[PDB]
Amino acid sequence: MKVILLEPLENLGDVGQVVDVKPGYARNYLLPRGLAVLATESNLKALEARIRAQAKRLAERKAEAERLKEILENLTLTIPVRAGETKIYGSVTAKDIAEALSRQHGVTIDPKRLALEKPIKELGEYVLTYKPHPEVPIQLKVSVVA
Amino acid sequence: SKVCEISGKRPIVANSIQRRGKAKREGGVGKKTTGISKRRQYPNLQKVRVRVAGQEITFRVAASHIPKVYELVERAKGLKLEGLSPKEIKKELLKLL
RNA sequence: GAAGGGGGCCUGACUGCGAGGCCUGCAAGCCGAGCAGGGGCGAAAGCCGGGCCUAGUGAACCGGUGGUCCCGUGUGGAAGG
RNA sequence: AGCCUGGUGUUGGCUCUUGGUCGCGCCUGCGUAGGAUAGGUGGGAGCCUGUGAACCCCCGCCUCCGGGUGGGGGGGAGGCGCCGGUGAAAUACCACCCUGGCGCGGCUGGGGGCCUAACCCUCGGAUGGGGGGACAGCGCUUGGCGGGCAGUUUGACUGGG
RNA sequence: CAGCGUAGGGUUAGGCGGGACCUAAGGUGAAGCCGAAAGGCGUAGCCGAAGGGCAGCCGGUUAAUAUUCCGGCCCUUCCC
RNA sequence: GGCGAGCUAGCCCUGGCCAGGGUGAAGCUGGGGUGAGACCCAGUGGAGGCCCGAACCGGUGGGGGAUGCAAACCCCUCGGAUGAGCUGGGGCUAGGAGUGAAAAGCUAACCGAGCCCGGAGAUAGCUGGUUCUCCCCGAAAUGACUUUAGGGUCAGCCUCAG
RNA sequence: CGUGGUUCGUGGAGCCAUGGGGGAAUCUGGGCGGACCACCGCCUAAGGCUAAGUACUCCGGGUGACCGAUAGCGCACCAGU
RNA sequence: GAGCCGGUAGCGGGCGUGGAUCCCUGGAUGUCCGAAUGGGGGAACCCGGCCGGCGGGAACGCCGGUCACCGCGCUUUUUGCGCGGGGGGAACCUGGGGAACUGAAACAUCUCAGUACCCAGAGGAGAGGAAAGAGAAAUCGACUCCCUGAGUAGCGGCGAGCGAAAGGGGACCAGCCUAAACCGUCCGGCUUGUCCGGGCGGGGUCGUGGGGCCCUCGGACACCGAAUCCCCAGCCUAGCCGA
RNA sequence: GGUGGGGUUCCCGAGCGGCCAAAGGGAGCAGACUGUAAAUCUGCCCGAAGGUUCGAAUCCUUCCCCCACCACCA
Ligand SMILES: [Mg+2]
Ligand SMILES: [Mg+2]
Ligand SMILES: [Mg+2]
Ligand SMILES: [Mg+2]
Ligand SMILES: [Mg+2]
Ligand SMILES: [Mg+2]
Ligand SMILES: [Mg+2]
Ligand SMILES: [Mg+2]
Ligand SMILES: [Mg+2]
Ligand SMILES: [Mg+2]
Ligand SMILES: [Mg+2]
Ligand SMILES: [Mg+2]
Ligand SMILES: [Mg+2]
Ligand SMILES: [Mg+2]
Ligand SMILES: [Mg+2]
Ligand SMILES: [Mg+2]
Ligand SMILES: [Mg+2]
Ligand SMILES: [Mg+2]
Ligand SMILES: [Mg+2]
Ligand SMILES: [Mg+2]
Ligand SMILES: [Mg+2]
Ligand SMILES: [Mg+2]
Ligand SMILES: [Mg+2]
Ligand SMILES: [Mg+2]
Ligand SMILES: [Mg+2]
Ligand SMILES: [Mg+2]
Ligand SMILES: [Mg+2]
Ligand SMILES: [Mg+2]
Ligand SMILES: [Mg+2]
Ligand SMILES: [Mg+2]
Ligand SMILES: [Mg+2]
Ligand SMILES: [Mg+2]
Ligand SMILES: [Mg+2]
Ligand SMILES: [Mg+2]
Ligand SMILES: [Mg+2]
Ligand SMILES: [Mg+2]
Ligand SMILES: [Mg+2]
Ligand SMILES: [Mg+2]
Ligand SMILES: [Mg+2]
Ligand SMILES: [Mg+2]
Ligand SMILES: [Mg+2]
Ligand SMILES: [Mg+2]
Ligand SMILES: [Mg+2]
Ligand SMILES: [Mg+2]
Ligand SMILES: [Mg+2]
Ligand SMILES: [Mg+2]
Ligand SMILES: [Mg+2]
Ligand SMILES: [Mg+2]
Ligand SMILES: [Mg+2]
Ligand SMILES: [Mg+2]
Ligand SMILES: [Mg+2]
Ligand SMILES: [Mg+2]
Ligand SMILES: [Mg+2]
Ligand SMILES: [Mg+2]
Ligand SMILES: [Mg+2]
Ligand SMILES: [Mg+2]
Ligand SMILES: [Mg+2]
Ligand SMILES: [Mg+2]
Ligand SMILES: [Mg+2]
Ligand SMILES: [Mg+2]
Ligand SMILES: [Mg+2]
Ligand SMILES: [Mg+2]
Ligand SMILES: [Mg+2]
Ligand SMILES: [Mg+2]
Ligand SMILES: [Mg+2]
Ligand SMILES: [Mg+2]
Ligand SMILES: [Mg+2]
Ligand SMILES: [Mg+2]
Ligand SMILES: [Mg+2]
Ligand SMILES: [Mg+2]
Ligand SMILES: [Mg+2]
Ligand SMILES: [Mg+2]
Ligand SMILES: [Mg+2]
Ligand SMILES: [Mg+2]
Ligand SMILES: [Mg+2]
Ligand SMILES: [Mg+2]
Ligand SMILES: [Mg+2]
Ligand SMILES: [Mg+2]
Ligand SMILES: [Mg+2]
Ligand SMILES: [Mg+2]
Ligand SMILES: [Mg+2]
Ligand SMILES: [Mg+2]
Ligand SMILES: [Mg+2]
Ligand SMILES: [Mg+2]
Ligand SMILES: [Mg+2]
Ligand SMILES: [Mg+2]
Ligand SMILES: [Mg+2]
Ligand SMILES: [Mg+2]
Ligand SMILES: [Mg+2]
Ligand SMILES: [Mg+2]
Ligand SMILES: [Mg+2]
Ligand SMILES: [Mg+2]
Ligand SMILES: [Mg+2]
Ligand SMILES: [Mg+2]
Ligand SMILES: [Mg+2]
Ligand SMILES: [Mg+2]
Ligand SMILES: [Mg+2]
Ligand SMILES: [Mg+2]
Ligand SMILES: [Mg+2]
Ligand SMILES: [Mg+2]
Ligand SMILES: [Mg+2]
Ligand SMILES: [Mg+2]
């Protein structure tokens, strides 16, 4: 008997998987325990509409980090820093990179999860990477003066 | 009232027919009736006890139609009442217009 | 003057019929010449449709089995008769 | 009628254990004889091994323990067959089969334990707790026991019966 | 003559009995349960008494009624 | 399919009734007894499907009655009479059913299956009965078969038409 | 599987119905023409309603080779008394 | 259209051509019981709540009104309200159940018989009805009823007995609504989604298969037409003239 | 009528493809022991026809009987 599963059951696998089973089970365990539902032409329909709606906004969300990959992976933000000899007085941080990328080239990042480790104290050419899920490396130029 | 609340099935009278001898088609001289008498045949009737809105509704049905109790539960719109409840969930919902 | 006993060849302990009668409430029971087919024994005339004879039996119905042509529920088959 | 009873519905979860059959695979058998420890029939002088052999070292199970047999491996370029004969058979390698066994897998079976959630009992208390539990109860169906009840049968002749 | 025909008259209660009180067997029965139909069952409730509870005694009077009318002496419950 | 437990049987609820005598259980008390007891003896006490006997409940024997006073009675006699007692009121159980200290008793004056109405004009190879008149003819009581023998079928014998 | 309906009493037993078990498809789908198979046809099940032609006679009327007070209704009458 | 105040005279009184009695239609009144329905109850009796009224009227009593249960419907479930049901009826009708005597010259299957009867329900009728039919003809067309087919075909301890249909002739005549596809709306659940579900409207209703959706065709007065509603004749419920 | 088992030296009884005078038991005979009787002990000794292989008590067909069982009877 065909039920739509409401959570992974360990042999009778994960959510939405249509599994067939002795009615007794269905009626007196799964169903009253809200841990599944019987697969009607009615409910099979919402399930399709449920898988569509998911993989819609899912591969919609992959339309950002595909779009921010094809912009930030060429454009370079250049950072002014009070100079020193191959050492910075302040520190350019995630926060800074964020802002600079905004005022300059007109883009917006979080800046959560870029490189949080050790806000960068030197000058040079760095490649930092952005996120979530397949994603983009960025070029950032820390230079001189103000 | 031993009758299925969904299907409508109720007890029928039937004859119970006692036969002797060998089928004509086994080369017997043919079957013979030593008796015929009325019996009845009940529906195979069960409790389906189910939870709908607040409440716990109990249908008495032929084991045959047991599925339709659950079909009727998949019909859910707006009842905060007491048992009855199925008075609603019933033939109003089985047929209506 | 065989229906008795012995021997030889044989399967008529045939098939298809059956004038005419015995008997007889019915239904049965009985005897039967003769013709046809194909035979047996006999040189032939002839005899042979079990046994000297009179008891050794059981209507119908229901069913079995073998065969045959007959019928086969729109039709051909088949089921079943 | 009642009672007993197989199948099946209501009727579920998890294991353990067994069949039956089918497909495939891996084996099994041995009369002195041929040299012996060759199931049957056919193909057959070609093979198989260096797609790492014989001979032993562990090890498995079978055995009429003559041993058969595979893996591990020490292991390194041989081991075979025809020929020959007192048993029909001929004793490599390749298939299709028999007899028994095991191995896995397929559909169906039969048992045993535990679980709980159907079902049943219960709890001044409940969308719950405890107990029993897929039994029992109940439907359909199987066969049985069944004067507890029912309907009837239980001849005629006859110096009355 | 009559228990007979015709006709006329005759039975007076806050306290006696019963009811505007209680419950018994049983009955009936919102809930609920069962049953082809009819209908069976059933908790509470309700009904149900010669049981429980509740305030009147003595006497006179009529052809015919009287703890009922009358006389005397007592009492009960509701309302304000 | 109904109607019946106003009779009768059992049970349920709730009331009532049983003159008067007699016998004298246990217990208690006292006294005796003993190491202590068992026990004994008194008095007290007032038990019991205990005794006699009215009411009440019965129905033993005999007589009478027998178109009765009476569809179960009357007389004499007799059993029980604090109990498994009797009895009023209110209730419940019924027809293959009830109820029965059990006779197949009782269940509205006949119960081996109640009454009523219906199926119903059941069936009756049996018994009875079958109604004006005149005319002609005029039998059988045998055979065969028959779950047949006092019933039938065919035959035989009567009759009527051609 | 168990039964009922039909003329069909298990019969070769279909058709219509359905208590039990299993349990589909949407025209290239389904049911039927008496087991079953082929062919050739018929029809479209699992929702519902639908006058009239028909049955009856409490009731009113009209007729009778219907009765005439033991008949005719049980009752001609103050009878379901 | 002249007598009347029933059967019913009588006593004692009254009425009518200013049209009585009497007949027909409508209305009003209509105690109590009874489905009986405020609640009880041994039918025709008893006891109440609510609002209003009467009496001196608080107690008491009377009067009017209202108050059972069930179903359906909306409604904010609720305060509720609306509409309905209930019971009776001679026979007739359908449906649920369903005998025996009897017949078989015994008796079980069989018969009696789906009778009697009990129960539910319907109405002036009820049932049935518009083919998943018939059944051998390229056949017929709903249903019911009569005649016939026919005591045929069959059924049957192939006994006793039971007993169809097609067709033909008549009577009457009629055919419709829906479900789904699809479209639109409202509401509900939500893991707002071209989502699922319920409600309503549209759409569609058939077997030379139909319908939905897309394209083209012109698809225009249209014609048809109720079983529903309205009017009318006619008929019924009193009478009247009448040689 | 059907199904399943059989058939072995005098009785029972196992009976297998490499022969199985054919296990075994008891019966019989002859020995040993002996109050009687025994118990113990030792020795003696393929239903049928056909058919498949080199080999048949073994496998098949068939036939005959036995046992067993189920079923039917107009
Ligand atoms: Mg049966
Ligand atoms: Mg359940
Ligand atoms: Mg099922
Ligand atoms: Mg001779
Ligand atoms: Mg002759
Ligand atoms: Mg000749
Ligand atoms: Mg016969
Ligand atoms: Mg025959
Ligand atoms: Mg001929
Ligand atoms: Mg022919
Ligand atoms: Mg045919
Ligand atoms: Mg044919
Ligand atoms: Mg356990
Ligand atoms: Mg537990
Ligand atoms: Mg408690
Ligand atoms: Mg629990
Ligand atoms: Mg069970
Ligand atoms: Mg008897
Ligand atoms: Mg018996
Ligand atoms: Mg005799
Ligand atoms: Mg004599
Ligand atoms: Mg004698
Ligand atoms: Mg007088
Ligand atoms: Mg007073
Ligand atoms: Mg009272
Ligand atoms: Mg009271
Ligand atoms: Mg009751
Ligand atoms: Mg009292
Ligand atoms: Mg009192
Ligand atoms: Mg008083
Ligand atoms: Mg006085
Ligand atoms: Mg007096
Ligand atoms: Mg006074
Ligand atoms: Mg009594
Ligand atoms: Mg006294
Ligand atoms: Mg003392
Ligand atoms: Mg004393
Ligand atoms: Mg005394
Ligand atoms: Mg005494
Ligand atoms: Mg005495
Ligand atoms: Mg005495
Ligand atoms: Mg006496
Ligand atoms: Mg006497
Ligand atoms: Mg006395
Ligand atoms: Mg005495
Ligand atoms: Mg009493
Ligand atoms: Mg009786
Ligand atoms: Mg009895
Ligand atoms: Mg009587
Ligand atoms: Mg009596
Ligand atoms: Mg009797
Ligand atoms: Mg008579
Ligand atoms: Mg009769
Ligand atoms: Mg008789
Ligand atoms: Mg003469
Ligand atoms: Mg005679
Ligand atoms: Mg006689
Ligand atoms: Mg005669
Ligand atoms: Mg039948
Ligand atoms: Mg049939
Ligand atoms: Mg028969
Ligand atoms: Mg067919
Ligand atoms: Mg069909
Ligand atoms: Mg057809
Ligand atoms: Mg057709
Ligand atoms: Mg259809
Ligand atoms: Mg239709
Ligand atoms: Mg109609
Ligand atoms: Mg009339
Ligand atoms: Mg007279
Ligand atoms: Mg008369
Ligand atoms: Mg006269
Ligand atoms: Mg009379
Ligand atoms: Mg006058
Ligand atoms: Mg006028
Ligand atoms: Mg009037
Ligand atoms: Mg009342
Ligand atoms: Mg009132
Ligand atoms: Mg009442
Ligand atoms: Mg008032
Ligand atoms: Mg009615
Ligand atoms: Mg009515
Ligand atoms: Mg009927
Ligand atoms: Mg009978
Ligand atoms: Mg009889
Ligand atoms: Mg008879
Ligand atoms: Mg007779
Ligand atoms: Mg008899
Ligand atoms: Mg019949
Ligand atoms: Mg009506
Ligand atoms: Mg009509
Ligand atoms: Mg209809
Ligand atoms: Mg009949
Ligand atoms: Mg016709
Ligand atoms: Mg027409
Ligand atoms: Mg519509
Ligand atoms: Mg929608
Ligand atoms: Mg619609
Ligand atoms: Mg529409
Ligand atoms: Mg199309
Ligand atoms: Mg005139
Ligand atoms: Mg000696």
Query: Inter-chain contact A31–B70, Cβ cutoff 8 Å?
Result: yes
Residues with CB under 7 A from strand H: A 41-43, 45-46, 49-50, 52-53, 56; B 11-13, 33, 35-36, 38, 74-78, 80-81, 87, 92-93, 96-97
Contact B75/A at CB under 8 A? no
Q: B49 and B61 in contact (C-beta within 8 Å)?
A: no
Chain A residues in contact with B74 by the CB 8 A cut-off are 38, 40, 42-43
CA atoms within 13 A on the CB side of B66: 14
Q: Given phi > 0 = left and psi -120 to 50 = alpha, else beta, which region is A105?
A: left
Closest by Cα among A117, A96, A92, A102 to A72: A102
* Token pair belonging to A80: 């002014």
CA-nearest residue to B52 within chain A is A32
When CB atoms are compared, the residue of B50, B51, B74 closest to A42 is B74
Contact B51/A at CB under 8 A? yes
How distant, in Å, are the alpha carbons of A111, B42, B82, B94 from that of A133? 15, 64, 52, 50
Q: Map tokens 């009253």 to a residue.
A: A32
Q: B75 and B56 in contact (C-beta within 8 Å)?
A: no
Contact B77/A at CB under 8 A? no
Ligand 27 center–CA B11 separation, angstroms: 25
How distant, in Å, are the alpha carbons of A112, A117, B85 from that of B2? 69, 77, 21
Burial label for A142, CB within 10 Å (0-12, 13-18, 19+), is: buried
Burial string for B39-77 (b: 16+ CB within 10 Å, else e) reads eeeebebbebebebeeeebebbbbeebbebbbebbeeee
Q: B89 and B52 in contact (C-beta within 8 Å)?
A: yes
Backbone angles phi, psi at A71, to 5 degrees: -115, -60
